[model samples]
Target chain A: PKQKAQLDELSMSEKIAILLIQVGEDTTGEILRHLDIDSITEISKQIVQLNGTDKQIGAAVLEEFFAIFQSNQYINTGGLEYARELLTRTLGSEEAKKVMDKLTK
Target chain B: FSEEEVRYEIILEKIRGTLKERPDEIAMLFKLLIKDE
Candidate 1:
C-alpha cells in the first residue's frame, strides 16, 4: 500500500501563517528555535486573517502567553510588571488598554 | 489607558483564565488580583 499521511493536513491559511511564524520578522533562525513546521503550520492558520491583519500575531502571542500560564509557569508580580512594560511597545497605552479591558471589570 | 494599566489588565486576564481552573490557589490568585488596584 502507498504511504498514508499520519497527521491531519492543514489549510492554506494555516500553512502560510506557519511559514510567517517560522520566518518571523526578525530572523529565520528564531522561527526554527520554537517549532516544527507541521505544528507551526497546522495551528498558525487559525490565527491568521486577511488584510495583513495583526489578528494572527496577537492570537499567537496570546496563545503563547496562556500556555505559560497553563503550564503553571506563571509570571511573578515583578515579571508581570515587566511584561506589561514590554506590551506597551506593541500595543501602545490606549489600544493596549482596549485589548486588555476584559481583565479589570 | 496608560502602559501600567494595559499591562495590569493583560496580567489580570491571564490570571482570570488561569484561576478558572485553580480557584483554590487563593494566595496566588489574590496576588494577581491586587495588581488591579
Candidate 2:
C-alpha cells in the first residue's frame, strides 16, 4: 500500500512519534530498513515536538521503534555501543552529542 | 539452567513452555548451528 495511506490511518500519537524520529534518525537509513523512506519521512516530519520533556522525544522514538514489528523482522535487544552509534549516525554528531551530554549527567 | 534457580523461575518456565509448545522448533532449530564448524 501507499505510505501516505498508511500514515493517514495511524493514530495521532503514532504520527507524532514518527515525526520525532525524523529529527533524530537518518530518514533514509533507519526507517527504510523497515519502512518505505518516502512514506516514513513524510509522516515523520508531521510528528510534533512535545513540551520540555526530552524523554517525550525519546518516548516517541522508542515507541515507534518498538511498534514496527510484524510476523517477521525482529527486534534485537540492547547493545550500548550500537545504540550509541545509531544515535550519533542517524541524528548527526551534534544533536547526538547533546543528547549524550544530557543523558550521562 | 534448571527450574530451581533465579529470581523468577517463570522465565525458565517460559523457555520450557516454548520448547514444549514448539518441540518442532528445536527439532528444526538452527540448521547451521555453528560458524566454521
Candidate 3:
C-alpha cells in the first residue's frame, strides 16, 4: 500500500513516539536502553498522549529516522560539515536544515 | 568512572523509581511481561 506522511506536520517527540510504536517491542526496548531517564519520560509521555498511530504518519516517521541514520553514516565518514553538505544536496538546503537542526539539537 | 557511566546510573535509578510508581505503565513501555493474577 502507498502511504504518505508529512514529516513536517509533526513535532520531533511525536515522530519518535510514533516510530517507537511502529518499530515493535524488542527494537524499541533496545533503543530505550541507550537513552536517559529524562528522554524515556518524555517519549513515554508522548506515547501515552498519542491516541494511536496513523499508518501513513508512522511510515513517514520511519522514513525520517532512515534519513537521520543515513546522516549519521555521513557524519562517521567525515564530520558534521560533510554530513550537512551531503544532506543539503540530497534533501535541499531548507529541508536539510530542519533535519540537521533536530538531529543536532 | 566516566561521567557518562555515572550519569547512566543516576538515570537508571530515576527510571527505577518511576517504574515502581506505575509498574504496569512503565512495564508496558519496556515491553515486560504483565500478569493479571
Leading candidate by lDDT: 3
Provide the TM-score for each candidate, comma-separated: 0.27, 0.25, 0.45
Q: Candidate 2's residue-wise lDDT over A1-105, tens digit each?
A: 354455446555444444334334433233324444454454445443332334333333433433231112333332333344457668987898687677667
Worst 10 residues of 3 chain A by lDDT: A69-78
CA deviation > 4 Å runs, candidate 2: A1-13, A16-23, A27-45, A48-54, A57-64, A67-73, A78-105, B1-37
**Best TM-score among the predictions, by candidate number:** 3
Q: After superposition, how far is residue A83 of candidate 2 from its true place, in Å?
A: 19
Q: RMSD for each model, in Å, please?
A: 15.5, 19.3, 14.7
Best by DockQ: 1
DockQ of 3: 0.03
Error of 3 at A41 (Å): 0.6
Superposed by TM-score, candidate 1 places the C-alpha of residue A42 at a distance from the truth, in angstroms, of: 2.1
TM-score of predicted structure 3: 0.45
Q: Cα lDDT of model 2 overall?
A: 0.39
Clashing pairs in 2: A19-A44
Q: After superposition, how far is residue A18 of candidate 3 from its true place, in Å?
A: 1.0
lDDT of 3 at A12: 70
Fnat for every candidate: 0.02, 0.00, 0.00
lDDT of 1 by residue, A24-53 (tens): 444323332354465445434443542243
